[PDB]
Enzyme design. Structure first.
Site, PDB file in Angstrom:
ATOM      1  N   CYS A 177     -24.075   8.056 -17.902  1.00  0.00           N
ATOM      2  CA  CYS A 177     -22.988   7.235 -18.414  1.00  0.00           C
ATOM      3  C   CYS A 177     -21.960   6.918 -17.335  1.00  0.00           C
ATOM      4  O   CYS A 177     -21.982   7.630 -16.330  1.00  0.00           O
ATOM      5  CB  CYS A 177     -22.293   7.972 -19.545  1.00  0.00           C
ATOM      6  SG  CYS A 177     -21.486   9.595 -19.266  1.00  0.00           S
TER       7      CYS A 177
ATOM      8  N   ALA B 226     -19.896  10.045 -16.184  1.00  0.00           N
ATOM      9  CA  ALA B 226     -20.655  10.982 -15.397  1.00  0.00           C
ATOM     10  C   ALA B 226     -20.520  10.660 -13.914  1.00  0.00           C
ATOM     11  O   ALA B 226     -20.532  11.581 -13.105  1.00  0.00           O
ATOM     12  CB  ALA B 226     -22.114  10.924 -15.778  1.00  0.00           C
TER      13      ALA B 226
ATOM     14  N   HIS C 293     -18.796   5.426 -10.131  1.00  0.00           N
ATOM     15  CA  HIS C 293     -18.413   5.650  -8.729  1.00  0.00           C
ATOM     16  C   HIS C 293     -17.446   4.594  -8.240  1.00  0.00           C
ATOM     17  O   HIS C 293     -16.443   4.869  -7.574  1.00  0.00           O
ATOM     18  CB  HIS C 293     -19.614   5.601  -7.797  1.00  0.00           C
ATOM     19  CG  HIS C 293     -20.750   6.599  -8.014  1.00  0.00           C
ATOM     20  ND1 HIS C 293     -22.019   6.406  -8.292  1.00  0.00           N
ATOM     21  CD2 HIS C 293     -20.534   7.951  -7.944  1.00  0.00           C
ATOM     22  CE1 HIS C 293     -22.552   7.577  -8.385  1.00  0.00           C
ATOM     23  NE2 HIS C 293     -21.669   8.491  -8.182  1.00  0.00           N
TER      24      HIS C 293
ATOM     25  N   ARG D  40     -22.873  20.518 -12.288  1.00  0.00           N
ATOM     26  CA  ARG D  40     -23.057  20.123 -10.878  1.00  0.00           C
ATOM     27  C   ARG D  40     -22.221  21.069 -10.026  1.00  0.00           C
ATOM     28  O   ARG D  40     -21.000  21.198 -10.147  1.00  0.00           O
ATOM     29  CB  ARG D  40     -22.569  18.725 -10.544  1.00  0.00           C
ATOM     30  CG  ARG D  40     -23.103  18.186  -9.217  1.00  0.00           C
ATOM     31  CD  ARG D  40     -22.688  16.720  -9.184  1.00  0.00           C
ATOM     32  NE  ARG D  40     -21.262  16.570  -8.981  1.00  0.00           N
ATOM     33  CZ  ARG D  40     -20.774  16.039  -7.865  1.00  0.00           C
ATOM     34  NH1 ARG D  40     -21.552  15.603  -6.888  1.00  0.00           N
ATOM     35  NH2 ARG D  40     -19.465  15.980  -7.709  1.00  0.00           N
TER      36      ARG D  40
HETATM   37  S1  CFM Z   1     -27.801  12.027  -9.220  1.00  0.00           S
HETATM   38 FE1  CFM Z   1     -26.860  11.241  -5.369  1.00  0.00          FE
HETATM   39  S2  CFM Z   1     -25.994   9.123  -5.652  1.00  0.00           S
HETATM   40 FE2  CFM Z   1     -24.651  10.470  -6.948  1.00  0.00          FE
HETATM   41  S3  CFM Z   1     -24.859  14.152  -9.210  1.00  0.00           S
HETATM   42 FE3  CFM Z   1     -27.701  12.526  -6.990  1.00  0.00          FE
HETATM   43  S4  CFM Z   1     -29.117  11.720  -5.466  1.00  0.00           S
HETATM   44 FE4  CFM Z   1     -25.542  11.961  -8.790  1.00  0.00          FE
HETATM   45  S5  CFM Z   1     -25.857  11.884  -3.411  1.00  0.00           S
HETATM   46 FE5  CFM Z   1     -24.482  12.628  -5.127  1.00  0.00          FE
HETATM   47  S6  CFM Z   1     -23.986  14.855  -5.422  1.00  0.00           S
HETATM   48 FE6  CFM Z   1     -25.432  14.173  -7.019  1.00  0.00          FE
HETATM   49  S7  CFM Z   1     -27.603  14.806  -6.850  1.00  0.00           S
HETATM   50 FE7  CFM Z   1     -24.615  10.137  -4.154  1.00  0.00          FE
HETATM   51  S8  CFM Z   1     -22.917  10.958  -5.486  1.00  0.00           S
HETATM   52  S9  CFM Z   1     -24.193  10.199  -9.197  1.00  0.00           S
HETATM   53 MO1  CFM Z   1     -27.221  14.360  -9.073  1.00  0.00          MO
END
Ligand code: CFM
Ligand code: CFM
Ligand SMILES: [Ca+2]
Ligand SMILES: [Ca+2]
Lengths: 457, 525, 457, 525
Positions: B52, B55, B185, B86
Site C-alpha cells: 500500500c 507501507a 516513497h 522491517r
Molecule cells: S521491498 Fe527495496 S525498493 Fe523499498 S522494505 Fe525491498 S528490494 Fe521495500 S531497497 Fe528498500 S529496505 Fe526494503 S527489502 Fe529500496 S526502499 S519499499 Mo522490502
C-alpha cells in the site's frame, strides 16, 4: 529496552504498543479453517500482505489470500468491479471450492455492499458449476482479530448451515480463536470419550504440517463444505469462547435451531473439567480411565511443583477468552494474577476476572480491558511482578526488568515448534505448569551464588 | 525469446493474459535488452507480493528516523504490522539521545472517529506524545479512512506545531494510493526535501559524503560507514536507518550523494543537485565488485591521490582478509541457479555477488519498481502514463541562492565519459542480466510455480509470504528483504555472512530426507 | 564452579564426577516394570535407600524396595538367613505377587548363592502359591545401571518367558533403559500400526502416575506376569538398543527359539524410520498417515529451524545406547558432535559413533568410552562447544562455562514434568528440535546488544 | 485407650512382632518416659529407610570439610550417591580458599580389583588428587568389599601421606558395619579427635565458642553465626559445616562447646572436655524458644555483664524483626496435627517450632537414634550393646597435662542446678513430648501407613522416599533433612523460611482438587 515514564501517566488518545490487532486476520484464520477455501481481502492490497505475513511469521507456514487490490478510484466507484475481476482470476488460476470474503477499513467506510456484488457475479455466471462465495464484514475500527474470527464463523453458518430434517448424533464444536494444536487436542478428547463431532474452523492440517515435497495452495485440513452444511442437523453446539465462538453459536441456533452451550476455553483444571462434563451431560458418555489419568498427572505435577508456584505474582496480557481461563489456571496453581490486560474490548473479560480474584481474596491486582503493553510496563516499574505470560512482544519488558517469560497467544513469531503443543486439556496444562516452573528455576540457577547453588530442585 | 511466456500465460483468462503479458520480458541479444511494463494496477484476485502507499512512507522511508515519534492515524493494524516487521537498526546518538524503534504510536481509530473524523484524537495524541516523550519532531501518517472521513491531518499538524513547539509533519499515504509502496516513497521524499533538508546549521567537514536511500536493515549502513570512516570520508547523513532528525536536516553538508537504493530516494538525489549543486552517483555497497567500483568511482569524483592511495590500501586489505572464504563460498556453490524477486532494487544489487559464487541468476523481477530500474534512467523522457503511479503531486526545486554551488565543474562529463563514473545515472537491471534471462514485474503465485516446476532453480530469493511456499516443495527460498534475521549483508563483512548463510542453507541435512523409506521403496510395509 | 585445570591431566586412577552409576538401580527400575513386583536389594542396607532415592528424585515418585539388611555377621555366615527372613516379611506385610531380587557388591564379593536359597525357600514351603521370587546377579563393580537393566531383563526371560506351544500373534518389544514416557510412545506407534505386542519392562502406569488421593504400593502399570509368560511363544522379539536390550532378546531366543531383532533406540529420523520399517517389513503391513504426518512435521521443523542448527558444536554425555542414537540425530540436524563421552564400558560405542563421523566428514571430535564429567569440562576449557546435552550434573559445566544445556538421560533431578514427554519417535524428535533451538535462541536473545535485539526470529 | 500400638503390631509374623513391639512406645502419666529399644539391627524385608556406616562416616560427618579431597575407596555407586544430595553449603575461605564441594572423587573399583585388591589403585589415585588439586588433607573412605578384599587402606594412607607431605586420613566405614548411619558417626569421631583436632596453633580468642555437630544445610550455620557474631562471641570451629581442615585442627581453642546434633558428635564433646577441659552445653538453634534459651545459657557460662545484656539486646531486636509473621503463621497453622520421623536429632528439634505455631506433634521417631536420644543421656549406664552390630572402636583419651584447663570452676554444678543449664548433659526427646504420644524407633512403611490412616495427620515430616508415599495419598509431607531445597530453617531469619514454606504447603489448592467432579456425586448420574 527503555524510555517509558516510570511515573504512571494515563493516556486518552495516544495508543502505544497495542495488545490487539485488526479484525481481517482473525477472519483470514477462520477461513483457512475450511478445506479448499482461499480468503479474499476486499479492500486495498496493503492489508492482505500485512495479515498473511503475520500468519506466516507465527506458524512458519504459508497464508494464502487474494485482493480486490483497491486503487484511488474505488473511493469514487466502490469495489464492485474489483471483486468481480478478483473472482475470475481466482477461479481461473487457482480454484478454491470456496472463496471466503471479508472487508477492511476502506470497504466499511465506502459502504460496500458485497451482498449485491455476489448475487451479480452469480447471476452473471462468474461463479462456476458447483463452487461458492461466502462473506463476512470485518470493520477494522471496532473490535480486534478475535472479532474477525467470530464474524467469519457467523458468515459461514449464515451461508452454509442447514437443517435438512435429519439429525446426526454429532455435536458441533467451534474451538474459538485457538491454534491448530488446540483444535487437534479437542478432537483427540471427543473421540477419547467416543463422541462424533463437526468442528469448525479446523486449522489442524492447514497451519502446521508436513514438508512432503509437493506444495498445495489448499492443504488438506479444515472443515469440508458438506460438513459445514450438516451443522444444522446436530443435536448441540459447544462454544469455546464467548468472545469468539458465540456469534456463530447463536446464529447456528437461530438459523438451523441447533441449541448451543458456552464453555470457557478448556485451559486448566476448572475449565477443562467443565469441558469433559459438558461432553457427559450431553451424550451420556462415561469418562474413560485415560482422561482420568491425564487429570491426575496434572494434579501430581501441580502438587509436586507447588513450592515454586505459590505466591508468584504474574503479569498476563492477551486475548479475552484465553487470558480469562489462563488467569483461572494461574490461581489454581497457587500464584497471583497481578496485572491482567486485554487490548480487545468488552466488559465481560474484566468483570469475569474481577470475580475470580475477589472470589479468591486476591487484592491489589489491576484488571485492564483495552490496555496495551506500555501500561503493563509502567505498572511493573511502580510494582515488580514475578512471571510474564504474553505473546512475542512481552520480551521487551522481560529483558528490561529481568522477568521469567512464558510466550502465550497470537502472535508468537519467535520460537520454533510452539504450534505443535496444546494449551488446552490436561496435556496442554501439564506443558504449561512445566514451562512456568522451568523459566523460574532457569532464572534462579542463573542468579544465585556459586556456593549457594543446588543439584536437585 | 518468448517460449516461457507461453507456459506462464497459457493458463490466464485472456483479458488478464493481455495485461499480464508486457510484464514478463525475456532478454535476447537479438532484442539486446528490451522494455518491460512496470507500475500499473495489480490485477484483482491474482496473488501478488505488493503493498500500500503507507507501507512505503511510514513503513520504509520515514519509519527509520530514530528520534521522531511516528504516529499512525487510522485503525490498529496499520501500526501493529509496522512494529518490528522491517528490521532497521538504531542505537541512540552517541549513548545519549532518543530512540523510538521499539514502540508504535497510533490513534487507534474507533467507529465514532470514522463517523465524526478523529481530528481532536490526533490533536490530543499529538500533544500527549510530545508531553511524554519530548521528541525531535512528530510525524503524523495517513491510513485509508483518514482521506475519506475528510480529516485534514495537514492543518491539525500546523496548529499542533505552533502550540507544541516541535516540528509536527503530516503525510498523506492512504493505502489506496498509487499501485504499490513505490508511490509511498514519492509522497515521503517530498515533505523531507521541502521542510526538513536544508533547514539547519551544522557546518560541513571535508570529504562529507551522504549515503542516500539506506535504511540500515540488519546493520548494513554501520558496515559501509565502517569502511568509509576508514578512508577519511565524513559520511554526513545516511538517509535513514539510524538517522537523527537533526542529521537529515543537515543532509546538505555533503559533497557527493551516494544513492544505494535508487527507487526510493532518486527524487531527493535529483532535487539536491538542483538546489545546492550536490551531484548524485549511483552507488552499490553490496557484493565485492559493486563495492570496489563504488569506492573507486567516488574517489575519482573527489579530486585527490592521497585519498585515492588510501582507498587502494583499504580496498586491498579488506578483500584479502575476506579472500579464503570467498574462495570457499565459490567452491560449494558454483553451478547453482538462483531466481531473485524483491521490490524496488534488491533483485539487482545481489546479482554481482551471486556471480562471485558461480551461481546463475536465471530469472529476476520487482514487485513495485518502474521501467528505468530495469532498462535505464534514460527511458524517463519516454513513459506512458495512464498508470496510477506518482499521479501523486510532483514538486519543483529552484537553486538555493545561498547554499547553491557547483562542486565539480565540467570534467563531470570527463567522469561519465572516461571510466564510466555513474554521475546522475543508473542503467537498470536488465542491462546486467545474462541472455536467456526472464524478468517478471509483479510476479504472482501462479508465475513462480511454473518458473519453479519448468525451470528448477537451486535457490529462490524472495520474502516471507513466499519463503514457505518455495521451501515446502523442496527448494531453498532465502529472503533478501529481512536477511533471515541475520546481518550485515552489505560491505566486505556482509558478503561473508551472506556467503555462509547460503552455503549452510543448501547443505542442510534434512533436505535430502523428505521422502520416507516405505514410500520411495517399501510401498507394502 | 571451580578447581578444574585448563591444562589436561589424563588420569588413570582417580575417577572424578562420573558418567555412570553401578549396576543395582537399572535392575531396580527394570523390576518396577513388572506389575505387582517389589524390587529387593539382596545385600547391603544403604544401597537400597540410595538407589530408591535416585528414582524418587528423578521422577518425583516413590520407588519401593526391600533390603536383606546385611550386617557384619552376614559377612561370615552368608546372606541366606537374611533373605529367608525378608521373603517372609515381604509376603505377610506388603504381599507382592513376585519379588524381584538383584544383588550388590557385598553379596557379590561374598559370593552369595541366591539360586540355592531360593530353592530352599519353597522346597521348605516358604514362598506361597501363585507367588515367586525371581533373581539376577548384579555386581556393582561391573558395567553400570544399563548393565543392571540388561541383567534384570535376562533374569525375567530366564524365570518366566516359557513356550507352551499355544502361540500368540505377537511381537515382543524390549524398550531399553528408557523412561516411562518413552515406553508409552513406543507402545503407541504400535497402536497406530495394529501390531499386537508385549512390551517388558513397562514403567508406564508406574514411575510417572496420577495423584489418586489414595496410595497404592503396587501401581497399576507394568508388564503382567501372565504376559511375561507368553513372551516364549510370540512371532518375533525386537530389542531397542544393544547394551540394555540384547541380553534378554538373545536369551529368550535361546530357551524358546523366538527370533530377535536388534534395532537402535528410536530417536530422530534414522532410528525411528527404522523402528517403523522393522515393524512393517516383519508384519507385512503399511505405515499410517498419522505417522507420515508426524514424520512430515518433523522434517519441516528441522528445515524451518535449520538456520540455527547448522554447524553447532555439541558436547554429549550420557548412556551408550541413547548417545549412539542422539549423536546421529545432531548429525542429521546439521550440528557437529564434538565431545561424545559415555561412562559406561563397551567397544561398540567407540566403533558406531566413530563410523558415524567418517561417513559425515566430521573432524576434530573427541569420542571417549568410559570417561567422566571432569574430562569433558577440561576439553571445553581448550575449545568450547555450543550446546551441552547431559543429565543434571552437566549444569555445573553449563553455568560455569555459559554453554546452552538441555538435560537428557539419567538423572534429571532439577525439573518437573520432564518424565511425561518422550525423546523417542517423531514426537520426541520434534520436542528435541524445539528445546535445543529455544536454548540457543534464548541465549542469543539474552547476550546480544540492545540494537541487535530482534522481534521475528 | 490407644490400640494404635496394638494396631501397628497385629499384622506381623510373630517372631517379628516380638522384636517390633519394643520399638513402638506411648509416653503417658503413669509412664512419663517409657523404655524404647533403639539401635537394634534392622529386620530384613521390611521397608526401612536406614542407610549404612559409609553414609554416616563419608557422606554425613567428614563430607562437609571443604578442602580435603574425600575419596571413596570402592565401586562407583558409593561415590556417585554422595554427589550433591546432602545439602551442606560451603564457600571458599576468604576468596582464595580451596573448595571441592561440587566434585566426587573415587578409585572406581573394578573386577580385577576385587580379585587382586584395588589397594594399588588407591595408592595411585591419592597422588593424582594431591598433584592435580593439592588438598589440605586427603581422606580415604572404604565401602563393603574393601574389608572383605584385604586392602588395608590405613597402611596405604599412612605411607602415601609421608611421601606426599599432606595428611592422608583412612576411615573404615564399610557399610555392612553397624546397623545404620550411627556407626559412621562413631568411626569419624575418633580419627578426627585423635589425629586432626588439637593440632593447630591459633592463639585462642575472646569468647571462642564452637558449634559442634553442625554441617551447614542450606546455610543454617551461616544464620547461627550471624546472631552469635552480632552478640560478640567468636565462633572458632563449626564441627564440620563449612570447615576448613585447619579450623578443625584448632577445634580445641574454644572455651564452651555448643552441641547441636547430639547423635553425631557427642563422642567429640565428651573426649574434648576430658582432654582439654572444654564443657559442652546442649544447644538448639531451631525454633525461637530453642534459640533464646541456648543464648541465655551460653551467657550463664561466659558470665560477663555486657555479654549477658548484649544477648538480651540482640534477642529482642531480632524477635521484633520476625514477629508479625510468626503470629500470622499461627493464625493459619494452629489446630494442625504433625508426625515426625527423621534421622537422630531433627524429630526432636523441630518439635518446639511446630508448637510455637500451634501445630501439635502426635507420633515421632528416629531412623538410627539410640536410647540416650529418645530417653536422656542418663540411661547411658543402663544401655548395653550389639544389635547384630558393634565392633566399633571405643577410643579412649587422657587429659593433656600441659594443655588441659578448668574453663568453668566447679561453678558448673551451681549451674546444673541453677536453672539446669544443660551443661554436659542432654534430656532426650520424650520429655518435650506430651502424654498419649507415640515414639517409634526405626519406622517401616507399614507403620507410617497404620499411623497415617488411623490418625490422619495434616503434615508428616520425613524425607525423600516417605515424602512421595505420604502426598500421593494426599497429605502434606515437607522434608526435614533436605529442607525442600530452601533454608535456613534454623536461626532467627530461618524461622520465617520454615513458617512460610509450611503454610504455603498446607494452602496449596491442588490438595483440594484431587477428586474429579464426575467420580464424586456426578458420574453414576
Ligand atoms: S521491498 Fe527495496 S525498493 Fe523499498 S522494505 Fe525491498 S528490494 Fe521495500 S531497497 Fe528498500 S529496505 Fe526494503 S527489502 Fe529500496 S526502499 S519499499 Mo522490502
Ligand atoms: S538423617 Fe540428624 S542425626 Fe545425622 S544426613 Fe538427619 S536428623 Fe543424617 S542432624 Fe544431621 S545433617 Fe542429617 S538430616 Fe545429626 S548428623 S546421619 Mo539426614
Ligand atoms: Ca513450517
Ligand atoms: Ca510425580
Amino acid at each position: 529496552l527503555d524510555a517509558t515514564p516510570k511515573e504512571i501517566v494515563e493516556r486518552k488518545a495516544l495508543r502505544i504498543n497495542p495488545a490487539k490487532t485488526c479484525q481481517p486476520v482473525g477472519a483470514m484464520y477462520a477461513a483457512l479453517g475450511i478445506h479448499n477455501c482461499l480468503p479474499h481481502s476486499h479492500g486495498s492490497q496493503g492489508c492482505c500482505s500485512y495479515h498473511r505475513t503475520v500468519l506466516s511469521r507465527h506458524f512458519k507456514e504459508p497464508a494464502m489470500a487474494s485482493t480486490s487490490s483497491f486503487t484511488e478510484g474505488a473511493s469514487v466507484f466502490g469495489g464492485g468491479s474489483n471483486i468481480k475481476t478478483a473472482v475470475k482470476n481466482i477461479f481461473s488460476l487457482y480454484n478454491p471450492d470456496i472463496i471466503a470474503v471479508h472487508t477492511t477499513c476502506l470497504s466499511e467506510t465506502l459502504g460496500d455492499d458485497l451482498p449485491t456484488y455476489i448475487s451479480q457475479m452469480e447471476d452473471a455466471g462468474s461463479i462456476p458449476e458447483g463452487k461458492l462465495v461466502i462473506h463476512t464484514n470485518t470493520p477494522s475500527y471496532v473490535g480486534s482479530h478475535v472479532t474477525g474470527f467470530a464474524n467469519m464463523v457467523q458468515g459461514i453458518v449464515n451461508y452454509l448451515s442447514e437443517n435438512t430434517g435429519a439429525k446426526n448424533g454429532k455435536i458441533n464444536v467451534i474451538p474459538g480463536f485457538v491454534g491448530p494444536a488446540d483444535m487437534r487436542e479437542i478432537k483427540r478428547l471427543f473421540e477419547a470419550m467416543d463422541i462424533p463431532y463437526i468442528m469448525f474452523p479446523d486449522t489442524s492440517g492447514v497451519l502446521d504440517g508436513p514438508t512432503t515435497g509437493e506444495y498445495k495452495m489448499y492443504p488438506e485440513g479444515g472443515t469440508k463444505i458438506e460438513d459445514l452444511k450438516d451443522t444444522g442437523n446436530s443435536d448441540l453446539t459447544l462454544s469455546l469462547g464467548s468472545y469468539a465462538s458465540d456469534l456463530g453459536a447463536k446464529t447456528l441456533e437461530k438459523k438451523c435451531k441447533v441449541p448451543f452451550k458456552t464453555l470457557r476455553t478448556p485451559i486448566g483444571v476448572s475449565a477443562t473439567d467443565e469441558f469433559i462434563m459438558a461432553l457427559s451431560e450431553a451424550t451420556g458418555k462415561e469418562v474413560p480411565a485415560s482422561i482420568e489419568e491425564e487429570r491426575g498427572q496434572l494434579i501430581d505435577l501441580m502438587i509436586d511443583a507447588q513450592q515454586y508456584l505459590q505466591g508468584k505474582k504474574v503479569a498476563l496480557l492477551g486475548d479475552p477468552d484465553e487470558i480469562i481461563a489462563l488467569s483461572k489456571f494461574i490461581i489454581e496453581l497457587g500464584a497471583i494474577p497481578k496485572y491482567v490486560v486485554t487490548g480487545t474490548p468488552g466488559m465481560k473479560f474484566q468483570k469475569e476476572i474481577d470475580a475470580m480474584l475477589a472470589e479468591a481474596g486476591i487484592e491489589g491486582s489491576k484488571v485492564k480491558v483495552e490496555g496495551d503493553f506500555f501500561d503493563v510496563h509502567q505498572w511493573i516499574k511502580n510494582e515488580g511482578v514475578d512471571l510474564l505470560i504474553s505473546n512475542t512482544y512481552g520480551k521487551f519488558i522481560a529483558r528490561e526488568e529481568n522477568i521469567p517469560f512464558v510466550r502465550f497467544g497470537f502472535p508468537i513469531m519467535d520460537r520454533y515448534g510452539h504450534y505443535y503443543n496444546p494449551k488446552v486439556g490436561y496435556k496442554g496444562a501439564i506443558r504449561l505448569v512445566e514451562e512456568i516452573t522451568n523459566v523460574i528455576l532457569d532464572k534462579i540457577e542463573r542468579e544465585c551464588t556459586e556456593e549457594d547453588f543446588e543439584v536437585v530442585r | 525469446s518468448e517460449n516461457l511466456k507461453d507456459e506462464i500465460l497459457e493458463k490466464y483468462i485472456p483479458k488478464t493474459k493481455k495485461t499480464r503479458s508486457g510484464h514478463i520480458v525475456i532478454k535476447t541479444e537479438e532484442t539486446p535488452n528490451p522494455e518491460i511494463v512496470a507500475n500499473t494496477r495489480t490485477v484483482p484476485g491474482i496473488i501478488t507480493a505488493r503493498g500500500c502507499a503507507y507501507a512505503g512512507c511510514k513503513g520504509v522511508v520515514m519509519g527509520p528516523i530514530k528520534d521522531m515519534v511516528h504516529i499512525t492515524h487510522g485503525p490498529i493494524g496499520c501500526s501493529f504490522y509496522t512494529w518490528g516487521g522491517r528490521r532497521f537498526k538504531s542505537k541512540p546518538e552517541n549513548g545519549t539521545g532518543l530512540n523510538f524503534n521499539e514502540y508504535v504510536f497510533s490513534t487507534d481509530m474507533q467507529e465514532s472517529d470514522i463517523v465524526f473524523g478523529g481530528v481532536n484524537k490526533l490533536k490530543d495524541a499529538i500533544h500527549e506524545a510530545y508531553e511524554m516523550f519530548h521528541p525531535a519532531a512528530i510525524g503524523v501518517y495517513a491510513t485509508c479512512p483518514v482521506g475519506l472521513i475528510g480529516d485534514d491531518i495537514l492543518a491539525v499538524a500546523a496548529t499542533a506545531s505552533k502550540e507544541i513547539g516541535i516540528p509536527v509533519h503530516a503525510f498523506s499515504c492512504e493505502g489506496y494510493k498509487g499501485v504499490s509502496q513505490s508511490a509511498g516513497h514519492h509522497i515521503a521524499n517530498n515533505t523531507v526535501m521541502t521542510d526538513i533538508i536544508g533547514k539547519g546549521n551544522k557546518e560541513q567537514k571535508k570529504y562529507s559524503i551522504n549515503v542516500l536511500g539506506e535504511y540500515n536493515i540488519g546493520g548494513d549502513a554501520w558496515e559501509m560507514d565502517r569502511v568509509l570512516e576508514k578512508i577519511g570520508y565524513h559520511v554526513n547523513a545516511t538517509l535513514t536507518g539510524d538517522a537523527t532528525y537533526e542529521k537529515v536536516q543537515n543532509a546538505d553538508k555533503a559533497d557527493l550523494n551516494l544513492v544505494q537504493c535508487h527507487r526510493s530516494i532518486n527524487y531527493i538525489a535529483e532535487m539536491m543537485e538542483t538546489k545546492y549543486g550536490i551531484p548524485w552517483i549511483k552507488c552499490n555497497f553490496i557484493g565485492v565488485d559493486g563495492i570496489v567500483e563504488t569506492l573507486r568511482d567516488m574517489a575519482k569524483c573527489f579530486d585527490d591521490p592521497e585519498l585515492t592511495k588510501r582507498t587502494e590500501e583499504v580496498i586491498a586489505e579488506e578483500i584479502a582478509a575476506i579472500q579464503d572464504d570467498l574462495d570457499y563460498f565459490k567452491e560449494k556453490l558454483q553451478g547453482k541457479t538462483a531466481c531473485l524477486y524483491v521490490g524496488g532494487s534488491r533483485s539487482h544489487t545481489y546479482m554481482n555477488m551471486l556471480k562471485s559464487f558461480g551461481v546463475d541468476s536465471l530469472v529476476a523481477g520487482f514487485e513495485f519498481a518502474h521501467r528505468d530500474d530495469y532498462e535505464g534512467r534514460e527511458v524517463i523522457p519516454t513513459i506512458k502514463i495512464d498508470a496510477d503511479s506518482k499521479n501523486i503531486p510532483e514538486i519543483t526545486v529552484t537553486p538555493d541562492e545561498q547554499k547553491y554551488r557547483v562542486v565539480i565543474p565540467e570534467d563531470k562529463v570527463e567522469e561519465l565519459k572516461k571510466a564510466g563514473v555513474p554521475l546522475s545515472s543508473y542503467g537498470g537491471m536488465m542491462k546486467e542480466m545474462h541472455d536467456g534471462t526472464i524478468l517478471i514485474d509483479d510476479m504472482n503465485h501462479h508465475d513462480m510455480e511454473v518458473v519453479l516446476e519448468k525451470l528448477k532453480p537451486d535457490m529462490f530469493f524472495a520474502g516471507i509470504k513466499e519463503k514457505f511456499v518455495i521451501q515446502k516443495g523442496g527448494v531453498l527460498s532465502k529472503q533478501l528483504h529481512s536477511y533471515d534475521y541475520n546481518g550485515p549483508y552489505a560491505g566486505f563483512r556482509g558478503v561473508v555472512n551472506f556467503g555462509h548463510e547460503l552455503v549452510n542453507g543448501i547443505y542442510t541435512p534434512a533436505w535430502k530426507m523428505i521422502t520416507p523409506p516405505w514410500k520411495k521403496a517399501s510401498s507394502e510395509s
